[PDB]
Design a protein around this ligand. Structure first.
Ligand code: 8CH
Length: 150
C-alpha cells in the first residue's frame, strides 16, 4: 500500500506533483493532495507568475479551472512547441498530474528539497515524497477524502 509523489522546485510557491510515475490524479484527488502539502490548486495568475520566475514542465496537470503545461522553451514534444501557460483544450480522458501552490514558499525559485507532507491525515498508506535529486521523505497516512479516488 504505497504512493510515490514526485515533486519539483517551487517557483513563486507553485510546484508540480506526479503520482506513481504516470497520469493518475483526478480533479477531486488533486485538491486533496495539494491540501496535504498545506497548498491549493494554483490560479491561472499564480501559474503565470511562476512561469515568469522560471517554471516549466513537460506534463499536463490541474490548476484551478483548467489542465495546463507551463512552457518557457519551445520543445516539439512538450505542448506542441508552444510557450507560455499552454491550456489543454481537447482530451477524452480525466486523469493527469497536478500543480499545487504554497503561499508560504519563497517568492522566486526555490530548488531546495521538500522534506514533509504536513497536512496528511491518519491512514494506512506509505506515502513517499520523491525529490528530483532523489532525496525522499516517507510517512504513513492518507490524503484522499473521496472514496472513488481510492
Ligand atoms: C519549503 O517550502 C514548503 O513549504 C514545502 C512545500 C511547498 C509544501 C509542503 C511542505 N514543504 S517542506 C518544509 O519543504 O517540506
Amino acid at each position: 500500500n504505497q504512493i510515490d509523489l514526485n515533486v519539483t522546485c517551487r517557483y513563486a510557491g507553485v510546484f508540480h506533483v506526479e503520482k506513481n510515475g504516470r497520469y493518475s490524479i483526478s480533479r477531486t484527488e488533486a485538491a486533496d493532495l495539494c491540501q496535504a502539502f498545506n497548498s491549493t490548486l494554483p490560479t491561472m495568475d499564480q501559474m503565470k507568475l511562476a512561469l515568469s520566475k522560471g517554471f516549466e514542465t513537460c506534463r499536463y496537470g490541474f490548476i484551478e479551472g483548467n489542465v495546463v503545461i507551463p512552457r518557457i522553451h519551445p520543445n516539439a514534444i512538450c505542448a506542441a512547441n508552444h510557450t507560455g501557460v499552454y491550456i489543454l483544450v481537447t482530451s477524452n480522458t480525466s486523469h493527469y498530474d497536478t500543480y499545487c501552490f504554497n503561499a508560504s514558499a519563497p517568492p522566486e525559485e526555490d530548488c531546495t528539497s521538500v522534506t514533509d507532507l504536513p497536512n496528511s491525515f491518519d491512514g494506512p498508506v506509505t506515502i513517499t515524497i520523491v525529490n528530483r535529486d532523489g532525496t525522499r521523505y516517507s510517512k504513513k497516512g492518507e490524503y484522499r477524502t473521496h472514496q472513488e479516488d481510492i
